């Protein structure tokens, strides 16, 4: 789907997503 | 298409309807240069040029509705447009637009 | 016994 992989440099980015979905 | 069956004709067909990126960049640069050239012109006069040629608007207008703005007479609209072009072919303010031809 | 519609038709 062209998004960043949840590993390495993009990992933190994906973390923020589950910081938003939890709230 | 080929000894190895993996290749096919379909993957050697171009898309002729696409716009080259250099052409799009040229269009953007032309818009910017036209805006810069017209910004050095009087409000009424630049408006006459803009809304005669349809720049930054949805449609184009002929001389009649451009006249119907303030001065309904058509000949003044023609003369002011001629003055627009006459000042727009001055070497002091026409070098940038020359490179786009 | 068969899957071809032609044979069933005949």
């Amino acid at each position: 789907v062209g998004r960043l992989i949840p590993a390495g440099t993009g990992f933190a980015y994906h973390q923020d997503r589950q910081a938003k979905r939890a709230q | 298409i080929g000894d190895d069956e993996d290749s096919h004709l379909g993957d050697f067909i171009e898309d002729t309807t696409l716009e080259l990126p250099l052409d799009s960049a040229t269009a953007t640069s032309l818009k910017a240069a036209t805006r810069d050239v017209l910004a050095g012109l009087t409000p009424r006069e630049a408006k006459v040029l803009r809304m005669r040629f349809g720049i930054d608007m949805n449609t184009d207008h002929t001389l009649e509705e451009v006249g119907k703005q303030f001065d309904v007479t058509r000949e003044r609209i023609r003369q002011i447009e001629a003055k627009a072009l006459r000042k727009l072919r001055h070497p002091s303010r026409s070098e940038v637009l020359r490179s786009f031809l | 016994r068969t899957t071809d519609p032609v044979r069933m038709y005949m």
Binding site: G2 | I13, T28, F53 | -
Partner: protein
């Protein structure tokens, strides 16, 4: 010695005399096409066979029928060169004579009522060029022979890898040339089953019931009978001595052991044995028994006899009981058990079963079942076991008769079944499927015949359909045949088949190897994914037939092979190899060709076997091979010998010097890469060779060979004219042989094809002498590369891995400079808006780019053109285009607007620089010719007129010379004749009848000469001036030929003949290169580390031998330079040619002074030496040659560093190596793309250098990026570089604006996938 050989004699280091010279290399193609195309009275091969197999055909009702009389081939419309120029297939018309014969309905059938003779056109048959190639659509193509399985019956097994236990299942398989396949297998329950074209198994008995076999007949066929009787109220058994060899034995005189040898007591011989009743209880019946009173069947065949059955047959009165034989080792109950498991009880119940398994889910009827089984195997139309197949079947089943038959019968099936049961029992063995006696060679002629038969059948269906209508009074045979299906079949085979391959034309060796190649793939062959280890392997029967070295390295390993040097095909398509007969202990020169089957029984010696003066073997025990195993055998037991040492290897492997010192892995690479060599400007002989180059050069056809002997009348770089000798003249012939040479013609791989004269005017030539040298040929010898000075040492890491360091001198003298000819086409078509025009009026282009263009818009000949230059100017009509408002204002300010047409013109490709050497214009009939077209038209007429006049002048000169000789047989004075003017000879008046008659004859001959010359000129003019048949919608085509001189540079791939390849890393200056004590620098520095690990030691020996040969060359160079006496030149040459105990006896004393001087002049640049494969030069000979040339015996010199002047610490191996420039050039392998074209559907960059595409970031690259953790780089590659259209446009804009940021979006491929999944009725969606 021939004159061409006498000019430069190669020294032979071989020791074994050659009895059989290597045959013509391209026989496998020419012989096959001659079989296909020539008329054979026996009608077993080619077009006659197809016509007789197809004709005569009969109408279903029977009113009339069509008969075949004869066939012929017409005259070709164009020649080979013309066909290549225009782009048409070189072919001949097929004209077949047929009789439409109409019978009489009222009269008895067979009465001839009317006949109609007529010739019918059956299509164009492509022709084979004298060199074994075809010209299809103007392209040279080669049809590769196929290795398939011969038709017949093969017996095989699963090797115990199918059932849970071992239980090796056995199967038999019959395959015809055309028809259905029949399989008889065994199950784990030991019952034989049947398959018909690989479907569900059925019991075997059906296949015999259908043949009309009752059960008792079946047990009679498949079993042996043992008889019992009631003699004197006792059980009596028919004793057979062999059977007996657990009960009490009768014949009290010679009682054997009782319930506890046989031969001793069976010596006397008796016939009466008594057996207990139990001996019958466990044994099965054999004959159906009926009682007259009861009228019922007491016991059936294949039923186990019981005690109650004994009682019934006792009361019934039957005394004799014949029963079957069943063992556990020699005989088996397989047939009886199969009959037990059978469900069919009669013939009809059998055909219904065959019909159900044939056509499942169909109502079975008797007539349809009978027709189906008749057509399956017993019908000639649908089943044809060919002559080869019939021979194989007869040999397999041991049948002697029915050689002409091609359809199966009862005896055939019962014999196949018998052999299968025998092989189970233990007598007999399965067949080796990879054995070369079980594999057949199918060449171009056979395949063309098959396709022509297919076309004949497709026409024939329609012909039979029409003949049944009945209204036939006004019809003709030519109104019944449509040639289009047959033409479609033949062009299908010759243009779209896998085995009709694009020609390999890098060098003569590539062409020869391509023509001598056998493929197991193609129609009726293998598949790469379905090929296993066994088929790819080297079989023991490949000896002398298939080369074990030459095969592609890759997925096609072992599936494509090369013919051996002496290999041949027999009349049945099986490869055979020659051998020398050994009679009475002597090794004779008589040669017998043996196949794989015949080779097994005999034991065959080797060419390496030592021989005595009397012609017999020297060693008492010689090394030989028998039945495929090598060993040591006595001298008197030896039957055959090998004819040559190069018999097992192909031509390419035969061209590798010192092959015996190279590992087979590297020999494979060397053989493969000798075919990728590119011809250079100047062809140089290999100093170290094998003696085969002359054969390849002559048989390739690239050279000009003398058809007849004589003296060279005229030489020019484009024409050789030979005055034929008096002894070799056809009566009434001109006496002139004219050879027109090909000059700078593009090859299939964009390489120059050029012929250079090697003769001088006035020198004598003979038959077979080389007059001109083609590409990669030097004085009749194959010249694939150049002789390079080689030093084996590391040099500052520039020869790391396989890298090559080359001196600049090699670049300066253009030793590896190649000419590449490239074709560029501009097609002016017809469009909806209008017709495209070829004019010089190109919008928005100044006169700077129009300088090289003429008035018609076509570039001149001889123009130096670089990348982007216009070659042909073409303008295409364009429709109205919307202009953006900013563009409208821009046009308002400056009024320039000229956009009626758009510039679509042919331009030189980027990074390509060359000269225009030829321009050809093709114009449709009905389109006006532009000025350039008429310029070329008139130039062609001028050239044709001049050349026709030249041939006329030379032929008339020769003919008048012969006439002058005839007159000089009497003798007169020609000054008086020359006093009268030549034309005025026709104005003489003669009154005597004798002179007047001669005058009239001369006038008539002059008129005939004028008429024939006129007809030739008219034919050529009509051919030149006629229009071209172009593709529909095409108006004009312009073709431009560009010649590019490509020079050596880093990135180019250079290799030798021993599998040592490399890429040039640096072009070193001459001063930096290592040099010897005499100041001579090396040319190429090679890494020694490559040699020990790859076991290619032949290259070191080649280096040493090249050093010695070049040293002898410098000795001859000096001895000529000091103008030394000819006697010492002769002495030195004789000493050189007498070195070693070789088979070559060259006498310099019998050579003339001019011949000796010419030989010395050809030997200045080095002495060519021949080292035959497996008969090469020993180390002692190399050391002796080095000693003669005043060089170190070790082959190592003291080298000094050019940079520092210091001597290297250890001696370095310096010599000469034959190096090749492979067709893997960095010019054709660079590619770079920033932004270009995109795919229509996926919206992704295209693929390939031709499309200016982008490299593929595959799955493993994504895996590597994920492993690194570079998420943003991966997102860049996925979205903004491949298929995010808006993202990539904004990314380009941002880079132009110097921002270097991306706004990724959704890849288009994902949206396409979503649309596809939606189209499958599946709802796939995205949520927020």
């Amino acid at each position: 010695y021939s004159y061409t050989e006498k000019k430069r004699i190669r020294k032979d280091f071989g020791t074994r005399p050659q009895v059989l010279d290597i045959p013509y290399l391209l026989s496998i193609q020419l012989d096959s096409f001659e079989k296909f195309i020539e008329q054979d009275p026996e009608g077993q091969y080619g077009l006659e066979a197809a016509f007789r197999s197809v004709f005569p055909i009969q109408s279903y009702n029977g009113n009339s029928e069509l008969q075949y009389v004869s066939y012929r081939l017409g005259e070709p419309v164009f020649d080979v060169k013309e066909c290549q120029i225009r782009g048409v297939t070189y072919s001949k018309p097929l004209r077949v004579k047929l009789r439409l014969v109409i019978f009489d309905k009222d009269a008895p059938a067979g009465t001839v009522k009317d006949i109609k003779e007529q010739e019918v056109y059956m299509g164009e048959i492509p022709l084979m060029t004298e060199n074994g190639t075809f010209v299809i659509n103007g392209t040279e193509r080669v049809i590769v022979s196929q290795l398939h399985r011969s038709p017949g019956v093969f017996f095989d097994s699963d090797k115990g890898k199918t059932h849970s236990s071992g239980k090796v299942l056995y199967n038999a398989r019959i395959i015809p040339y055309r028809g259905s396949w029949l399989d008889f297998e065994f199950d784990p329950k030991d019952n034989l089953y049947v398959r018909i074209d690989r479907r569900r198994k059925l019991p075997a008995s059906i296949i015999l019931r259908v043949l009309g076999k009752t059960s008792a007949e079946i047990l009679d066929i498949f079993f042996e009978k043992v008889n019992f009787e009631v003699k004197d109220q006792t059980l009596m058994m028919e004793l057979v001595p062999e059977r007996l060899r657990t009960f009490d034995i009768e014949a009290d005189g010679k009682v054997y052991v009782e319930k506890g040898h046989i031969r001793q007591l069976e010596k006397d011989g008796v016939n009466f044995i008594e057996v207990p009743v139990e001996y019958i209880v466990g044994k099965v019946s054999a004959k159906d028994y009926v009682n007259e009173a009861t009228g019922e069947l007491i016991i059936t065949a294949n039923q186990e006899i019981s005690l109650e059955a004994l009682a019934n047959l006792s009361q019934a009165g039957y005394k004799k009981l014949e029963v079957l034989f069943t063992n556990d080792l020699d005989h088996g109950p397989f047939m009886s058990e199969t009959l037990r498991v059978d469900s069919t009880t009669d013939r009809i119940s059998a055909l219904v079963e065959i019909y159900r398994m044939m056509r499942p889910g169909e109502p079975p009827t008797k007539e349809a079942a009978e027709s189906l089984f008749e057509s399956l195997f017993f019908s000639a139309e649908r089943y044809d076991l060919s002559t080869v197949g019939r021979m194989k079947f007869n040999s397999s089943i041991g049948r002697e008769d029915a050689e002409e038959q091609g359809t199966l019968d009862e005896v055939d099936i019962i014999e196949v079944m018998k052999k299968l049961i025998s092989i189970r029992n233990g007598k007999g063995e399965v067949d080796d499927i990879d054995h070369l006696g079980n594999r057949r060679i199918r060449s171009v002629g056979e395949m063309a015949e098959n396709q022509f038969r297919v076309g004949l059948v497709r026409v024939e269906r329609a012909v039979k359909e029409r003949l049944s209508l009945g209204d036939l009074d006004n019809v003709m045979p030519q109104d019944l045949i449509n040639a289009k299906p047959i033409s479609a079949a033949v062009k299908e085979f010759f243009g779209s088949s896998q085995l009709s391959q694009f020609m390999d034309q890098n060098n003569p060796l590539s062409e020869v190897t391509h023509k001598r190649r056998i493929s197991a793939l193609g129609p009726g062959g293998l598949t790469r994914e379905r090929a296993g280890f066994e088929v790819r392997d080297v079989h023991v029967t490949h000896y002398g037939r298939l080369c074990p070295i030459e095969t592609p390295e890759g997925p096609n390993i072992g599936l494509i092979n090369s013919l051996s040097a002496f290999a041949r095909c027999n009349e049945y398509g099986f490869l055979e190899t020659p051998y020398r007969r050994v009679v009475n202990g002597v090794v004779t020169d008589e040669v017998d060709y043996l196949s794989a089957i015949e080779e097994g029984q005999f034991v065959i010696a080797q060419a390496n076997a030592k021989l005595t003066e009397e012609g017999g073997f020297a060693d008492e025990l010689v090394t030989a091979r028998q039945k495929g195993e090598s060993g040591l055998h006595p001298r008197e037991h030896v039957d055959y010998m090998d004819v040559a040492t190069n018999q097992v290897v192909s031509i390419a492997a035969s061209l590798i010097p010192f092959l015996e010192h190279d590992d087979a892995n590297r020999a494979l690479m060397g053989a493969n890469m000798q075919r990728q060599a590119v011809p250079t400007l100047r062809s140089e002989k290999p100093l170290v060779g094998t003696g085969i180059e002359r054969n390849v050069a002559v048989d390739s056809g690239v050279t000009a060979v003398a058809k007849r002997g004589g003296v060279i009348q005229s030489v020019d770089a484009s024409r050789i004219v030979v005055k034929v000798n008096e002894e070799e003249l056809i009566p009434g012939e001109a006496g002139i042989d004219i050879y027109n040479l090909t000059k700078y013609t593009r090859s299939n791989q964009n390489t120059c094809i050029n012929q250079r004269p090697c003769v001088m005017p006035g020198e004598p030539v003979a038959r077979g002498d080389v007059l001109a040298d083609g590409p990669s040929t030097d004085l009749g010898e194959l010249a694939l590369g150049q002789n390079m000075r080689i030093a084996f040492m590391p040099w500052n890491g520039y020869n790391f891995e396989d890298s090559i360091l080359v001196s600049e001198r090699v670049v300066q003298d253009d030793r590896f400079t190649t000419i590449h000819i490239q074709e560029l086409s501009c097609v002016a078509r017809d469009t909806k808006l209008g017709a495209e025009e070829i004019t010089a009026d190109i919008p928005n282009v100044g006169e700077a780019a129009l300088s090289k263009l003429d008035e018609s818009g076509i570039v001149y000949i001889g123009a130096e053109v670089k990348g982007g230059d216009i070659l042909v100017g073409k303008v295409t009509p364009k429709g109205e285009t919307q202009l953006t408002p900013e563009e409208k204002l821009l046009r308002a300010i400056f009024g320039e607007k000229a956009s009626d047409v758009k510039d679509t013109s042919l331009r030189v490709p980027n990074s390509v620089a060359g000269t225009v050497i030829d321009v050809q214009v093709f114009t449709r009939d009905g389109v006006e010719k532009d000025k350039r077209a008429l310029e070329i038209e008139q130039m062609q007429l001028k050239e044709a007129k001049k050349d026709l006049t030249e041939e006329f002048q030379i032929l008339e000169g020769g003919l008048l010379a012969r006439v002058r000789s005839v007159l000089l047989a009497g003798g007169y004075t020609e000054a008086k004749l020359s006093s009268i003017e030549r034309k005025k000879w026709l104005e003489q008046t003669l009154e005597n009848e004798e002179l007047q008659n001669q005058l009239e004859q001369l006038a008539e001959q002059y008129d005939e000469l004028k008429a024939d010359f006129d007809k030739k000129f008219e034919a050529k003019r009509r051919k030149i001036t006629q229009g071209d048949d172009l593709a529909p919608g095409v108006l004009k085509i312009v073709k431009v030929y560009l010649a590019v001189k490509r020079r050596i540079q880093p990135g180019d791939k250079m290799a030798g003949r021993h599998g040592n390849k490399g890429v040039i890393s640096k072009i070193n200056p001459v001063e930096d290169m290592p040099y010897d004590e005499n100041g001579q620098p090396v040319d190429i520095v090679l890494n020694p580390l490559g040699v020990p690990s790859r076991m290619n030691i032949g290259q070191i020996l080649e280096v040493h031998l090249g050093l010695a040969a070049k040293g002898i060359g410098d000795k001859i160079n000096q001895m000529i330079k000091e103008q030394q006496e000819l006697a010492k030149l002769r002495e030195f040459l004789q000493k050189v040619y007498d070195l070693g105990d070789t088979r070559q006896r060259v006498d310099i004393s019998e050579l003339s002074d001019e011949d000796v001087r010419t030989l010395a002049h050809n030997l200045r640049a080095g002495l060519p030496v021949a080292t035959p494969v497996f008969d090469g030069a020993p180390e002692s000979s190399i050391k002796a040659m080095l000693e003669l040339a005043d060089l170190p015996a070790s082959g190592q010199l003291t080298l000094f560093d050019g940079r520092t002047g210091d001597a290297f610490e250890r001696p370095v191996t310096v010599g000469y190596m034959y190096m090749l420039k492979l067709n893997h050039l960095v010019d054709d392998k660079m590619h770079a793309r920033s932004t270009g074209s995109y795919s229509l559907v996926t919206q992704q960059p295209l693929g390939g250098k031709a499309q200016f595409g982008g490299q593929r970031f595959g799955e493993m690259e994504v895996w590597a990026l994920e492993a690194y953790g570079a998420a943003y780089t991966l997102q860049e590659m996925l979205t903004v570089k491949s298929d995010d259209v808006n993202g990539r446009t904004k990314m380009y804009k941002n880079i132009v604006d110097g921002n270097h940021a991306m706004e990724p979006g959704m890849p288009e491929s994902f949206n396409v996938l979503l649309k596809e999944i939606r189209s499958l009725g599946i709802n796939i969606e995205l949520e927020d």
